[model samples]
Target: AQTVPYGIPLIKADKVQAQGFKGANVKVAVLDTGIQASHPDLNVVGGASFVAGEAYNTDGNGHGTHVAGTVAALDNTTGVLGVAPSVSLYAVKVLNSSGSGSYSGIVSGIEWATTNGMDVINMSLGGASGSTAMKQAVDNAYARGVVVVAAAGNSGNSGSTNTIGYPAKYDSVIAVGAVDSNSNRASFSSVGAELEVMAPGAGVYSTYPTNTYATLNGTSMASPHVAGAAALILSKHPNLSASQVRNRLSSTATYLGSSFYYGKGLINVEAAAQ
Candidate 1:
């Protein structure tokens, strides 16, 4: 049990929660390092592993557990809360304990998420070298009414370079970059034309493995906010298409100067959901 994550208020997810849009009935898949399935705050309904030899129950690297917390760290009376505390979280373990996985595993993760009929899929890991299989799979997922969100990666220099990576750069995906609790774009977040929105990423507090909590950084920390936001919209307005949900997020964003750094600006979950 802990206080609501600081970023939750920064993004207004706390306000959205008050409005009763906790993504109830929505299915979310986090494709990253495995999750510590036993984490109490995370009522992680179920999951599977695409990693070659590992069980899907372990979050040896801690990244997936952190990401899962952002997406659905239950609203249980005493524990911390997330944007979509009522979502059905599934761990699509593609990355291993070292936080590494093959392109094929990632692509297969996409395949599994879409095939399993997930409402929102968050891929917080990516690479610069785009792959045809990945792009096609993402496109296929979007075409199936699944909202795909991804991290823009962390190799940026205030738009000095385009570090937007694959899957994130795909038109079918919502490419999210990083902003901090102060609502300023984090210097480490990749920025580019492909970037769609920004979220609280730097020093974000969320659930970690072994039933713990930690503060982490990078666009990886930013992507799940958007994912949970997408879930919120879906819960409140279940009929909207994936594209409309994406637009709702972008159109309601709190625009910061310099499109390169903030894209459509930091996401406003309350604005978008309510």
Candidate 2:
């Protein structure tokens, strides 16, 4: 118990372990700034960078590191645990150190993840515009049987049309909104019909660079929870199609009434995996 990790609450609330799966044998590609492959709590099996002058294995911004930890921090009793701790995570560095990248980079990441045999693709980055190329990449990934999850964007207000960014706005990807521990929607989380679900994002604890820990808030954080859930589900139901995995997550969510703000509701990994 000395580890004293802040912990991922879905682990207990949904009784993820009650299903007896650790997300083993699942490959999830994190298409973000990059990953800290040297982080003590992580084991990035593979990665590549589309950004010039930057390496895919190094996380200069720390955003990707935090995101990766949320997706697959090992349950080794020291660092914080991930929703699917045993899933293999890959680094697809499409964003630069400024936490920004071009649309082509994102499309390439998606294409690469699908071609490389990733079961799940987590995209915590987004922009204000839509692109036909981006939509095509997401569609291609889905067709390749890769479940894609993305942030629903932070620019949203209650009782207003959601301004979720590209790639996430595409129908093929699961656009996730942010909710707090109390299940209250985060005001910053985008609320649109494109949103597929909500997840815990406020003050969420997970691993950071250099083997440290941090708490961040964003739909970015919420997206990875679903990605982890998908990994856990695939571990138990290996033959399920990408659409089936997406359906499993939404079907198991705790509905909160408003589709725009709450979507299918808070994600329950344990319940979904079962």
Candidate 3:
């Protein structure tokens, strides 16, 4: 009966509470704009910035914080909750205040997360095309034992073509799409063969900067749901490799329909943890 965000229940994160897995001892790095270190709902253990003159611990555009909150915002009576409520969050600011950055910045962020021992890396940012450097970084991270998850991009169409973006389209990374409460695909959520899973994206309520909250839309909001779910699985099976964790997630997921749109389907954290 605890107050929680819509995604918490939609993704079955709330159902696993009885098992007592709160993503303890697992490290999740938010590779994006930045995070509001002062946000009471978040537990930013440490961070580093790649953007020029930007602090990794403070969010300027608010997108990074919102994504961070969805992954690990503290479970409390007031405010919202996250999938992995007690996860150790690290801010790796690859994007600037304008929420725009080159692939080089993202490449650096992924390398840092790999060297720093981050269990899960949540990337809610991407471009329309792929880059050799970006692919190498993502591939290296997967080989180095970091579970990378990213948004499938927001350039979706009602009648889909191949709208998935880079980094996400990389074979090493998990590309997540967006779904509403009824498990219908969000029109704004990109779809393609690379799409790996679906999550609560439209109108996802989460933490904002300055100790506040907001509801945002996009595949950006969906990526973190899987990121948090990865942390939950990692916390329980600490020895599982990045690829193994991915298998556990997709294999346990509830089939939502098309592989092109929903990938393996919506992630089931409750079943994943068990």
Candidate 1 accuracy as TM-score: 0.97
Q: Write the per-residue lDDT of candidate 1 for residues 148-249, one digit (tens) a residue.
A: 999998988642677798889999999999988788888888878898999989998888989888899989889999999999999999998999999999
Cα deviation of 254, candidate 3, in Å: 1.4
Candidate 3, 186: how far from true, in Å? Answer: 0.6
Clashing pairs in 3: none
Assess candidate 3 and give its lDDT.
Answer: 0.90
lDDT of 2 by residue, 91-186 (tens): 999999899998898889999999899999999989889788999999999998999999999997755767887778998999998888777888
lDDT for every model?
0.89, 0.84, 0.90
Off by over 4 Å in 2: 1-7, 11-14
- Model 3, 92-180: lDDT tens digits are 99999899987888889999999999999999999888899999999999999999999999998556588898889999999999999
Clash pairs for candidate 2: none
**Could you tell me the TM-score of candidate 2?**
0.95
Candidate order by TM-score, highest to lowest?
1, 3, 2
Candidate that scores best on lDDT: 3
lDDT-best of 2 and 3? 3
